[model samples]
Target: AEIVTALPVPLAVAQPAPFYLTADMFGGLPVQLAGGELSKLVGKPVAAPHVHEVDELYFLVSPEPGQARIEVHLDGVRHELVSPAVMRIPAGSEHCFLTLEATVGSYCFGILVG
Candidate 1:
């Protein structure tokens, strides 16, 4: 069975809140595409890090004429990543991005299995 639907992309309010453009929000399946700008995250301390029950893939893309630097903690190991990078976090693993550095503009994307 299949269903066809359309929905607008959800916008954020300029803070570090993760904006989600979920599939179910458009009457689709359980997957989710979550993204948010990193400009609002600069100079802020790392927030509460948590683990997910499902697998997730994260992508960091740089803006035009600029670059981004991010610190990711996955399974108690720290990793520094630049833009145009992707990371995979398996289920039951603790993961989080501790810092975000961007010049003009940058964003983070995540695909979650739900």
Candidate 2:
């Protein structure tokens, strides 16, 4: 029998602050995972609307009592996601987190398929 142990991955400070994680953090995994603290302090259009060759999925969670407005543009369609929601952007689709309103202790987890 083979045993595999999982450990906490190290994170790096990405652009615009509060965004962290790297492709190599998961032991050469094919997918890239990242997390961002979403709040009024660090929440001014974190990522610009853009399209990519790979698909991306986002899961957002609120650790405490707070509210934030997250707008995701998927293929030109606008979607407002509440905290504790999952959003998926298909490959080649234009998307981004437009804004965050009065957020507190919220975070967004993302996975990109490579």
Candidate 3:
């Protein structure tokens, strides 16, 4: 019963590829996820919670026009639409992070917790 999506686009047929997922990934974003961020702020005392400050809630999708893929994250449930043209949700709802794959050039990105 859980479903949502973000959005994406590509061009760079001109500028640089729009990929900038840096350290402290969830530091400046705007989604107040249901984890530590909320549990604490709202005074739940149960320890709400990831990428860093808690409740990562970051994600993205690049429009490939006709490509295709599907996956799910459990902290919550989300059936993403990857190709064949689709649409989405997330922001304050504890959504995950997102990104595009560059098969032509070389790059490095991603994060984790101990």
Task: Give the number of the best model, judged by TM-score.
Answer: 1
Candidate 1 residue-pair clash tally = 0
Per-residue lDDT tens digits for candidate 1, residues 59-98, read 8887653388888888778898888888998887878885
lDDT of model 2 at position 17? 31
TM-scores of the models, in the order given: 0.75, 0.67, 0.24
Per-residue lDDT for 50 in model 1? Answer: 71
What would the per-residue lDDT of candidate 3 be over residues 43-88, giving only the tens digit for each residue?
A: 2222121113332322222234323233324246645434332223
Off by over 4 Å in 2: 1-20, 41-47, 64-66
lDDT (tens digit, per residue) of candidate 2 on 28-96: 667766665667535354566666678888877786534655777776787887777888888887777
Ranking 2 against 3 by lDDT, winner: 2
Please state the error at residue 56 of candidate 3 in Å. Answer: 13
Candidate 1: Cα lDDT at 64: 58
| Count of steric clashes across candidates, in order | 0, 0, 15
- Candidate 3: worst-modelled 10 consecutive residues by lDDT: 34-43
